[PDB]
Design an enzyme around this catalytic site. Structure first.
Site, PDB file in Angstrom:
ATOM      1  N   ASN A 133       0.837  -1.230   0.223  1.00  0.00           N
ATOM      2  CA  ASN A 133       0.048  -0.005   0.039  1.00  0.00           C
ATOM      3  C   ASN A 133       1.141   1.308  -0.019  1.00  0.00           C
ATOM      4  OD1 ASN A 133      -2.049   1.816   0.577  1.00  0.00           O
ATOM      5  ND2 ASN A 133      -2.561   1.202   2.180  1.00  0.00           N
TER       6      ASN A 133
ATOM      7  N   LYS B  36      -0.305   4.402  -0.602  1.00  0.00           N
ATOM      8  CA  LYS B  36      -0.630   5.661   0.436  1.00  0.00           C
ATOM      9  C   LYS B  36      -1.002   6.644  -0.926  1.00  0.00           C
ATOM     10  CE  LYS B  36      -0.686   3.462   4.683  1.00  0.00           C
ATOM     11  NZ  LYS B  36      -0.283   3.590   6.222  1.00  0.00           N
TER      12      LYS B  36
ATOM     13  N   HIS C 106      -9.309   0.474   4.823  1.00  0.00           N
ATOM     14  CA  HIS C 106      -8.476   0.974   5.506  1.00  0.00           C
ATOM     15  C   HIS C 106      -8.134   1.488   6.829  1.00  0.00           C
ATOM     16  CE1 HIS C 106      -4.187   1.769   6.081  1.00  0.00           C
ATOM     17  NE2 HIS C 106      -3.944   1.362   5.249  1.00  0.00           N
TER      18      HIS C 106
ATOM     19  N   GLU D 186      -6.989   4.839   7.756  1.00  0.00           N
ATOM     20  CA  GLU D 186      -7.179   5.670   7.911  1.00  0.00           C
ATOM     21  C   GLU D 186      -8.287   6.351   6.983  1.00  0.00           C
ATOM     22  OE1 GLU D 186      -3.679   5.531   5.376  1.00  0.00           O
ATOM     23  OE2 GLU D 186      -2.537   5.167   6.968  1.00  0.00           O
TER      24      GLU D 186
ATOM     25  N   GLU E 160      -4.284  -4.616  10.692  1.00  0.00           N
ATOM     26  CA  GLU E 160      -4.228  -3.772  10.793  1.00  0.00           C
ATOM     27  C   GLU E 160      -4.061  -2.821  12.043  1.00  0.00           C
ATOM     28  OE1 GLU E 160      -3.912  -1.727   6.709  1.00  0.00           O
ATOM     29  OE2 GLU E 160      -1.964  -3.044   6.871  1.00  0.00           O
TER      30      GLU E 160
ATOM     31  N   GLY F 156       2.367   2.847  10.919  1.00  0.00           N
ATOM     32  CA  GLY F 156       3.040   3.691  10.242  1.00  0.00           C
ATOM     33  C   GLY F 156       3.968   4.401  12.204  1.00  0.00           C
TER      34      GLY F 156
ATOM     35  N   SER G 219       3.520  -2.184  10.439  1.00  0.00           N
ATOM     36  CA  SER G 219       5.044  -1.630  10.913  1.00  0.00           C
ATOM     37  C   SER G 219       5.893  -2.750  10.037  1.00  0.00           C
ATOM     38  CB  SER G 219       5.394  -1.654  12.061  1.00  0.00           C
ATOM     39  OG  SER G 219       4.779  -0.402  12.147  1.00  0.00           O
TER      40      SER G 219
END
Ligand code: NA
Length: 248
Positions: free
Chosen positions: A9, A11, A93, A95, A165, A171, A211
Protein backbone atom coordinates in the site's frame (compact mmCIF):
# COMPACT_ATOMS: atom_id res chain seq x y z
CA UNK A 1 -3.02 -24.67 0.96
CA UNK A 2 -3.65 -20.88 1.13
CA UNK A 3 -1.40 -18.99 -1.29
CA UNK A 4 0.96 -16.60 0.56
CA UNK A 5 -0.07 -13.01 -0.22
CA UNK A 6 1.91 -9.77 -0.03
CA UNK A 7 0.32 -6.40 -0.71
CA UNK A 8 2.07 -3.04 -0.96
CA UNK A 9 0.00 0.00 0.00
CA UNK A 10 1.85 3.05 -1.28
CA UNK A 11 -0.73 5.39 0.33
CA UNK A 12 -0.33 9.05 -0.67
CA UNK A 13 3.25 8.70 -1.89
CA UNK A 14 4.80 8.86 -5.31
CA UNK A 15 5.78 10.88 -8.33
CA UNK A 16 6.26 9.77 -11.93
CA UNK A 17 10.01 9.60 -11.25
CA UNK A 18 9.91 7.85 -7.85
CA UNK A 19 7.31 5.34 -9.11
CA UNK A 20 9.32 4.62 -12.22
CA UNK A 21 12.31 3.79 -9.98
CA UNK A 22 10.20 1.67 -7.59
CA UNK A 23 8.70 -0.28 -10.51
CA UNK A 24 12.14 -0.76 -12.15
CA UNK A 25 13.43 -2.25 -8.87
CA UNK A 26 10.45 -4.64 -8.72
CA UNK A 27 10.88 -5.50 -12.41
CA UNK A 28 14.51 -6.58 -11.82
CA UNK A 29 13.87 -8.57 -8.65
CA UNK A 30 13.86 -12.31 -8.04
CA UNK A 31 10.50 -13.08 -6.42
CA UNK A 32 9.26 -16.31 -4.84
CA UNK A 33 6.85 -17.62 -7.44
CA UNK A 34 4.61 -19.00 -4.64
CA UNK A 35 3.77 -15.45 -3.46
CA UNK A 36 0.76 -13.56 -4.80
CA UNK A 37 1.85 -9.90 -4.98
CA UNK A 38 -0.30 -6.80 -5.29
CA UNK A 39 0.72 -3.13 -5.26
CA UNK A 40 -1.57 -0.14 -4.68
CA UNK A 41 -0.46 3.18 -6.23
CA UNK A 42 -2.33 6.49 -5.88
CA UNK A 43 -5.25 6.56 -8.32
CA UNK A 44 -3.69 8.95 -10.84
CA UNK A 45 -0.61 6.65 -11.24
CA UNK A 46 -2.70 3.49 -11.84
CA UNK A 47 -2.29 3.77 -15.66
CA UNK A 48 1.51 4.35 -15.45
CA UNK A 49 2.01 1.40 -13.09
CA UNK A 50 -0.38 -1.03 -14.88
CA UNK A 51 1.55 -0.32 -18.15
CA UNK A 52 5.10 -0.57 -16.77
CA UNK A 53 4.91 -3.23 -14.11
CA UNK A 54 5.72 -6.92 -14.57
CA UNK A 55 2.42 -8.75 -15.13
CA UNK A 56 2.98 -11.29 -12.34
CA UNK A 57 2.40 -8.45 -9.84
CA UNK A 58 -1.21 -7.25 -9.90
CA UNK A 59 -2.39 -3.66 -9.26
CA UNK A 60 -4.89 -2.33 -6.70
CA UNK A 61 -6.71 0.92 -6.13
CA UNK A 62 -6.64 2.29 -2.59
CA UNK A 63 -10.40 2.96 -2.44
CA UNK A 64 -13.58 3.01 -4.52
CA UNK A 65 -17.31 3.90 -4.15
CA UNK A 66 -20.58 1.90 -3.99
CA UNK A 67 -22.32 2.88 -7.24
CA UNK A 68 -21.69 2.32 -10.97
CA UNK A 69 -21.72 5.99 -11.86
CA UNK A 70 -23.30 9.29 -11.00
CA UNK A 71 -23.08 12.55 -9.13
CA UNK A 72 -20.23 11.73 -6.76
CA UNK A 73 -17.55 14.29 -7.47
CA UNK A 74 -14.15 12.87 -6.49
CA UNK A 75 -15.20 9.21 -6.35
CA UNK A 76 -14.25 6.22 -8.55
CA UNK A 77 -16.50 3.23 -9.29
CA UNK A 78 -15.41 -0.43 -9.38
CA UNK A 79 -16.61 -0.42 -13.03
CA UNK A 80 -13.97 2.19 -13.83
CA UNK A 81 -11.28 0.11 -12.16
CA UNK A 82 -12.22 -2.99 -14.19
CA UNK A 83 -12.37 -0.83 -17.32
CA UNK A 84 -8.71 0.19 -16.79
CA UNK A 85 -7.63 -3.37 -15.95
CA UNK A 86 -7.17 -2.84 -12.20
CA UNK A 87 -8.13 -6.19 -10.60
CA UNK A 88 -7.86 -5.33 -6.86
CA UNK A 89 -9.05 -2.72 -4.39
CA UNK A 90 -8.15 -2.03 -0.76
CA UNK A 91 -11.28 -1.28 1.28
CA UNK A 92 -11.83 -0.21 4.88
CA UNK A 93 -8.24 0.85 5.48
CA UNK A 94 -7.67 2.25 8.99
CA UNK A 95 -7.03 5.76 7.64
CA UNK A 96 -10.38 5.71 5.73
CA UNK A 97 -12.33 4.37 8.78
CA UNK A 98 -10.68 6.69 11.31
CA UNK A 99 -9.70 9.89 9.41
CA UNK A 100 -12.36 9.86 6.67
CA UNK A 101 -15.14 8.42 8.84
CA UNK A 102 -16.03 5.32 6.82
CA UNK A 103 -18.49 3.25 8.89
CA UNK A 104 -18.49 -0.54 9.19
CA UNK A 105 -21.62 -0.64 6.97
CA UNK A 106 -20.21 1.76 4.34
CA UNK A 107 -17.09 -0.40 4.09
CA UNK A 108 -19.31 -3.51 3.79
CA UNK A 109 -21.34 -1.88 0.98
CA UNK A 110 -18.11 -1.11 -0.91
CA UNK A 111 -16.87 -4.68 -0.48
CA UNK A 112 -20.11 -6.12 -1.88
CA UNK A 113 -20.33 -3.69 -4.80
CA UNK A 114 -16.66 -4.20 -5.73
CA UNK A 115 -16.97 -8.00 -5.67
CA UNK A 116 -20.19 -7.89 -7.72
CA UNK A 117 -18.36 -5.79 -10.32
CA UNK A 118 -15.57 -8.40 -10.60
CA UNK A 119 -12.87 -6.90 -8.39
CA UNK A 120 -10.85 -8.74 -5.77
CA UNK A 121 -10.83 -7.03 -2.35
CA UNK A 122 -8.31 -6.57 0.42
CA UNK A 123 -10.76 -5.90 3.30
CA UNK A 124 -9.04 -4.20 6.25
CA UNK A 125 -10.03 -4.59 9.91
CA UNK A 126 -8.34 -3.83 13.22
CA UNK A 127 -8.51 -2.29 16.67
CA UNK A 128 -7.34 0.96 18.25
CA UNK A 129 -4.79 1.22 21.04
CA UNK A 130 -7.64 1.74 23.56
CA UNK A 131 -9.56 -1.31 22.32
CA UNK A 132 -6.33 -3.40 22.58
CA UNK A 133 -5.74 -2.13 26.14
CA UNK A 134 -9.33 -3.06 27.07
CA UNK A 135 -8.82 -6.58 25.73
CA UNK A 136 -11.47 -6.03 23.09
CA UNK A 137 -9.43 -6.67 19.93
CA UNK A 138 -11.53 -9.60 18.71
CA UNK A 139 -14.83 -7.94 19.62
CA UNK A 140 -13.87 -5.06 17.32
CA UNK A 141 -12.64 -7.36 14.53
CA UNK A 142 -15.86 -9.42 14.87
CA UNK A 143 -18.04 -6.28 14.56
CA UNK A 144 -16.15 -5.17 11.43
CA UNK A 145 -16.33 -8.64 9.88
CA UNK A 146 -20.01 -9.11 10.76
CA UNK A 147 -20.89 -5.95 8.85
CA UNK A 148 -19.13 -7.37 5.75
CA UNK A 149 -20.76 -10.80 6.21
CA UNK A 150 -24.19 -9.07 6.39
CA UNK A 151 -23.69 -7.72 2.85
CA UNK A 152 -21.76 -10.50 1.07
CA UNK A 153 -22.49 -14.18 0.40
CA UNK A 154 -20.45 -17.22 1.38
CA UNK A 155 -19.27 -17.58 -2.23
CA UNK A 156 -18.38 -13.85 -2.38
CA UNK A 157 -15.55 -14.50 0.16
CA UNK A 158 -13.51 -16.42 -2.46
CA UNK A 159 -12.16 -13.09 -3.81
CA UNK A 160 -11.58 -11.46 -0.40
CA UNK A 161 -8.29 -11.26 1.48
CA UNK A 162 -8.67 -10.03 5.08
CA UNK A 163 -6.00 -7.59 6.28
CA UNK A 164 -5.66 -7.43 10.08
CA UNK A 165 -3.86 -4.15 10.89
CA UNK A 166 -3.83 -2.99 14.53
CA UNK A 167 -4.20 0.80 14.32
CA UNK A 168 -1.42 1.22 16.93
CA UNK A 169 0.99 -0.66 14.60
CA UNK A 170 0.38 1.44 11.48
CA UNK A 171 3.39 3.67 10.75
CA UNK A 172 4.41 3.80 14.44
CA UNK A 173 7.35 1.40 14.27
CA UNK A 174 5.58 -0.88 16.73
CA UNK A 175 4.89 -4.23 15.11
CA UNK A 176 2.60 -6.85 16.63
CA UNK A 177 4.62 -9.69 18.06
CA UNK A 178 4.24 -13.15 16.42
CA UNK A 179 2.11 -14.15 19.44
CA UNK A 180 -0.17 -11.11 19.18
CA UNK A 181 -0.69 -11.49 15.43
CA UNK A 182 -1.14 -15.27 15.48
CA UNK A 183 -3.79 -15.06 18.24
CA UNK A 184 -5.86 -12.53 16.28
CA UNK A 185 -5.49 -14.42 13.01
CA UNK A 186 -6.57 -17.69 14.62
CA UNK A 187 -9.56 -15.90 16.21
CA UNK A 188 -10.58 -14.28 12.90
CA UNK A 189 -10.35 -17.73 11.22
CA UNK A 190 -12.53 -19.22 13.98
CA UNK A 191 -14.99 -16.35 13.51
CA UNK A 192 -15.17 -17.20 9.79
CA UNK A 193 -15.76 -20.88 10.58
CA UNK A 194 -18.61 -20.17 13.03
CA UNK A 195 -20.31 -17.33 11.17
CA UNK A 196 -19.65 -17.95 7.47
CA UNK A 197 -18.42 -21.55 6.89
CA UNK A 198 -15.57 -23.91 7.60
CA UNK A 199 -14.60 -23.79 3.92
CA UNK A 200 -14.39 -19.97 3.93
CA UNK A 201 -12.32 -20.18 7.13
CA UNK A 202 -9.86 -22.68 5.57
CA UNK A 203 -9.59 -20.82 2.24
CA UNK A 204 -9.44 -17.16 3.16
CA UNK A 205 -6.03 -15.45 3.38
CA UNK A 206 -5.63 -13.42 6.55
CA UNK A 207 -2.69 -11.07 6.17
CA UNK A 208 -1.01 -8.92 8.80
CA UNK A 209 -0.12 -5.28 8.51
CA UNK A 210 1.40 -2.65 10.76
CA UNK A 211 5.12 -1.94 10.72
CA UNK A 212 6.09 -5.05 8.71
CA UNK A 213 9.67 -4.82 7.46
CA UNK A 214 12.55 -6.96 6.21
CA UNK A 215 13.67 -7.68 9.76
CA UNK A 216 10.38 -8.92 11.27
CA UNK A 217 8.60 -10.55 8.35
CA UNK A 218 10.22 -14.00 8.53
CA UNK A 219 9.06 -14.83 12.07
CA UNK A 220 5.55 -13.54 11.43
CA UNK A 221 5.36 -15.62 8.23
CA UNK A 222 6.07 -18.79 10.22
CA UNK A 223 2.83 -18.37 12.20
CA UNK A 224 0.21 -20.95 11.15
CA UNK A 225 -2.68 -18.51 10.62
CA UNK A 226 -0.70 -15.65 9.03
CA UNK A 227 -0.98 -15.86 5.22
CA UNK A 228 1.12 -12.81 4.35
CA UNK A 229 1.25 -9.10 4.81
CA UNK A 230 -0.12 -5.66 3.93
CA UNK A 231 2.95 -3.42 3.81
CA UNK A 232 2.85 0.38 4.00
CA UNK A 233 6.14 2.22 4.48
CA UNK A 234 8.34 -0.70 3.49
CA UNK A 235 6.44 -1.10 0.18
CA UNK A 236 8.12 2.05 -1.14
CA UNK A 237 11.57 0.53 -0.58
CA UNK A 238 13.67 -2.35 -2.01
CA UNK A 239 13.06 -4.36 1.22
CA UNK A 240 9.52 -4.99 -0.11
CA UNK A 241 11.20 -7.79 -2.10
CA UNK A 242 12.46 -9.41 1.13
CA UNK A 243 8.88 -9.40 2.48
CA UNK A 244 7.54 -11.01 -0.73
CA UNK A 245 10.28 -13.57 -0.04
CA UNK A 246 9.53 -13.91 3.69
CA UNK A 247 9.10 -17.73 3.48
CA UNK A 248 12.31 -18.11 1.42
NA1 NA B 1 -21.50 -23.93 2.23
Amino acid sequence: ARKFFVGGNWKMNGSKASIKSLVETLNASKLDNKTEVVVAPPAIYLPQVRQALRKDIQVAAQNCYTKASGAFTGEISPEMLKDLGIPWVILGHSERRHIFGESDEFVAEKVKYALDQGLKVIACIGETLEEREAGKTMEVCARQLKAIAKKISESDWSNVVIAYEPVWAIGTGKVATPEQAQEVHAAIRKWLAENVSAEVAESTRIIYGGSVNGGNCAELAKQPDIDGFLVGGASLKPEFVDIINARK
